[PDB]
Amino acid sequence: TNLCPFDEVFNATTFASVYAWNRKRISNCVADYSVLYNFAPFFAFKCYGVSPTKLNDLCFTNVYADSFVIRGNEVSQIAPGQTGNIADYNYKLPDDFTGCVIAWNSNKLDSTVGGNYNYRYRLFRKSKLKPFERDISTEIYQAGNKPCNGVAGVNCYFPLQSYGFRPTYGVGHQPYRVVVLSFELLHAPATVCGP
Amino acid sequence: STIEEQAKTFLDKFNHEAEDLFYQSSLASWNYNTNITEENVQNMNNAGDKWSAFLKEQSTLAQMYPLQEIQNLTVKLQLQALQQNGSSVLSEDKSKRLNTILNTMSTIYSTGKVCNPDNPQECLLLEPGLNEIMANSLDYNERLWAWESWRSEVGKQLRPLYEEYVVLKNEMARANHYEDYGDYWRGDYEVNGVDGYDYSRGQLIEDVEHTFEEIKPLYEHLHAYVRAKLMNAYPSYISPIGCLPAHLLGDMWGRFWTNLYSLTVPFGQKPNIDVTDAMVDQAWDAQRIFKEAEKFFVSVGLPNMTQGFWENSMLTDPGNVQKAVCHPTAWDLGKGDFRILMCTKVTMDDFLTAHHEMGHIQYDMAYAAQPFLLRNGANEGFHEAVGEIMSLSAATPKHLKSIGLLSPDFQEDNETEINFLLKQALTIVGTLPFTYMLEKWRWMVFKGEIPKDQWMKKWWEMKREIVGVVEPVPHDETYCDPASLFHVSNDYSFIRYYTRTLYQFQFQEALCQAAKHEGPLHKCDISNSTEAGQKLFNMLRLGKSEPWTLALENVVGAKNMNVRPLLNYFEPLFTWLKDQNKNSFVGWSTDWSPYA
Ligand SMILES: *[C@@H]1O[C@H](CO[C@@H]2O[C@@H](C)[C@@H](O)[C@@H](O)[C@@H]2O)[C@@H](O[C@@H]2O[C@H](CO)[C@@H](O)[C@H](O)[C@H]2NC(C)=O)[C@H](O)[C@H]1NC(C)=O
Ligand SMILES: *[C@@H]1O[C@H](CO)[C@@H](O[C@@H]2O[C@H](CO)[C@@H](O)[C@H](O)[C@H]2NC(C)=O)[C@H](O)[C@H]1NC(C)=O
Ligand SMILES: *[C@@H]1O[C@H](CO)[C@@H](O)[C@H](O)[C@H]1NC(C)=O
Ligand SMILES: *[C@@H]1O[C@H](CO)[C@@H](O)[C@H](O)[C@H]1NC(C)=O
Ligand SMILES: *[C@@H]1O[C@H](CO)[C@@H](O)[C@H](O)[C@H]1NC(C)=O
Ligand SMILES: *[C@@H]1O[C@H](CO)[C@@H](O)[C@H](O)[C@H]1NC(C)=O
Ligand SMILES: *[C@@H]1O[C@H](CO)[C@@H](O)[C@H](O)[C@H]1NC(C)=O
Ligand SMILES: [Zn+2]
């Protein structure tokens, strides 16, 4: 039996940034919900649409795993119907989202003295993201009426800022690795489910 | 895009950046304060320069959003903070001269030594030596020698510098669209824009005189009592109808009358309330003290301390290998980092200082959600007010009984209450006239009502008429007596102490009324009162987002400063002073001087 490889999307070395969240497909496998309760400390295991207990005896079409790390006081924005810098400009979920959100503290391997400026988020954007959309653009945000012509300067700002995690911040500024799972059902026959 | 969006975006980018730079500066300063080493000094100096450079650059980049097109009052205070010009309005030569004058005055104050008329190799400085003489000596001549020497071998060297400093600061204030430097200082209390909560810069003065008029009688009675009991230690040196000489007040400048408790004790026989022996015999340490103080704050609804507070903070002297500055301070590094640096010992004073510092920490934690520039007290007199009001309840005998100290069959007599009230009055009520006189003198000097050739004459006339203190030796126009104080040699404000002293008792009265307390106000404990915690937290969380008038109204229900709560606290002492002063003269005469 080919088990679902939920061992590389939950235990990788380096996770993606907020503005470049990775998406890995999981299909044609057998569920391993038991090992999911490893890494016992969970800051959140909120689920939507379906109950965690009944997720075992359910067959779907495709399961998507999205991974990124956000600060402590911003985990609340990973949920339907939320507004904020993370929700509007980085990651948006639909109002009818079905799945679970998993978050746990990571201030042991995602922080360093001096600052971990390898994780960055989008701060300014002209529009607001529609649900499930990425944007790896790096143009200069025009905050005025005079064109910037792709350089920095008055009323022209770089869109991406860097967190700078340090291992002495609080439980709201400390890093938190967040993995969200989405369940979709299509006209194709259901295959992704265990015994 | 209107100016509103352009200002909002600029502030939104400034407030991520400032957070990182301030954190790294605060971490460097904390590392220096824990380890006094050359490498740490280098890191502190190298990290406290990027902050200044970035602040100046953003202030220069924030002058293009005029404050008449912006209509949000939350974005108009950040721009007010960021648009201050300071000393940048001056030329390069003027700024260099001002910095040199300030540094020279600070150096002369710090490294200042007076030397004896006797053998000239052994001679002292202020700390220690010139404070031990002023605090623990009963000789009339030695105190006079110290008082005259400090103002003779230091005061001469600041007047030529203070003249140019006054001129340059007035020119800078006028260039920054003000009236003088005193108006610049008063601008902290200025509120405009919000209807019904305005406060002009000139109204602060009038409020100060209005409060001092009501404060006058209690201070006059206390002055008469201190004069009456101070004539026993100096039988032939104090006039029954005159003013108290300046070198007999228990302090170098007479700021506090605390060191007169040994000479002016109401009932000497009865001890005071001390729990040092009880703490020692119960095996108490710094951890126990801070846990009890934490339980005190938990009892009123305020939250716990952060887990990082216990691990990242130093509460005991490291020892001999490490060298640190043993000054009790509360640190708000930002981004969730709260630390307390204090060399705790097993003493009642440290027990109260722990509550004071944790009150500061709670105040800092309250407004962590506000923007960076608004993360401060509403005015310059709330942080100490909160500390003192939270410290006051800890010294009550009932709270001591609650925490298992002091025997549970203690008889709280009606004489230890008088002793405690007089001890509190010697340090709370005896400093308001001094602060008022000093601030009024500096304000009049800045405005120009006092010409340059009348500084000392006006200073001594004001001290004689307001405070009730007469100089022991005549002073000409060559001395500069006010500059001998730390807060005058180093550029600092002084009315914040008066303002905080009036604020603290208003806060205490409001919280005790909210706690359903019955009896005298000085027997009040706010423990086990959720309402008194919510009422305070409603103001603690605002920060600078709202004017100080609204913040004061949110707690005390009033609109401005008041002195009735202060005089209610000292009411039994006031009645006792009337009872004891029946056969004495209440008041002083300006004419009498010791050298007349
Ligand atoms: C603050 O209150 C605690 C808890 O007391 C309880 O809650 C009160 C509101 C009231 O309803 C009491 O009757 C309750 O017992 C006090 O702690 C108790 O103190 C008494 C002293 O008589 C002691 O016998 C109990 O064992 C204590 N309970 C504990 C430690 O859990 C505390 O003394 C109060 N602090 C004050 C009044 O300053
Ligand atoms: C701070 O100082 C700068 C100059 O150092 C001021 O900028 C000038 O202000 C005057 C005032 O009318 C204008 O005429 C100039 O056009 C401004 N720019 C320059 C380059 O001179 C600035 O206004 C000052 N800030 C405040 C709050 O007064
Ligand atoms: C996660 O990876 C680490 C690194 O080798 C390993 O020690 C640990 O056992 C892994 N945990 C799981 C649940 O796979
Ligand atoms: C002021 O700016 C803040 C910043 O978001 C905004 O929430 C608030 O609504 C603004 N005030 C008004 C009256 O619109
Ligand atoms: C504060 O800490 C104590 C002991 O750690 C705990 O019992 C209490 O529940 C905490 N308070 C809150 C509000 O969590
Ligand atoms: C502080 O102590 C010494 C210098 O006194 C220093 O070498 C050491 O690294 C410091 N300890 C810390 C930072 O924990
Ligand atoms: C204290 O109480 C006693 C007993 O009533 C009374 O005689 C005395 O005047 C009161 N005041 C003082 C200061 O002792
Ligand atoms: Zn304080």
Numbering used by the authors:
A (entry chain B): 333 to 527
B (entry chain A): 19 to 614
Wording from the paper:
Receptor binding is a key step for SARS-CoV-2 infection. In this study, we evaluated the binding properties of BF.7, BQ.1, BQ.1.1, XBB and XBB.1.5 RBDs to human ACE2 (hACE2) and determined the cryo-EM structures of hACE2 in complex with BF.7, BQ.1, BQ.1.1, XBB and XBB.1.5 RBDs, respectively.
In addition, BQ.1 is another descendant of BA.5 sub-variant, which has gained K444T, N460K mutations compared to BA.5, and has evolved into BQ.1.1 and BQ.1.1.18 by gaining R346T substitution. In addition, RBD N487 also forms an H-bond with hACE2 Y83 in the BQ.1.1 RBD/hACE2, XBB RBD/hACE2 and XBB.1.5 RBD/hACE2 complex structures. In the BQ.1.1 RBD/hACE2, XBB RBD/hACE2 and XBB.1.5 RBD/hACE2 complexes, RBD N477 contacts to hACE2 S19 with an H-bond. In the XBB RBD/hACE2 and XBB.1.5 RBD/hACE2 complex structures, hACE2 H34 forms an additional H-bond with RBD S494. The H-bonds and salt bridges interaction network in patch 2 of all these five cryo-EM complex structures are extremely similar. The side chain of F486, V486 and P486 point to the α1 and α2 helixes of hACE2. Though the side chain of V486 is shorter than that of F486, V486 is also a hydrophobic amino acid that can interact with the hydrophobic amino acids, L79 and M82, in the hACE2 through van der Waals force (VDW).
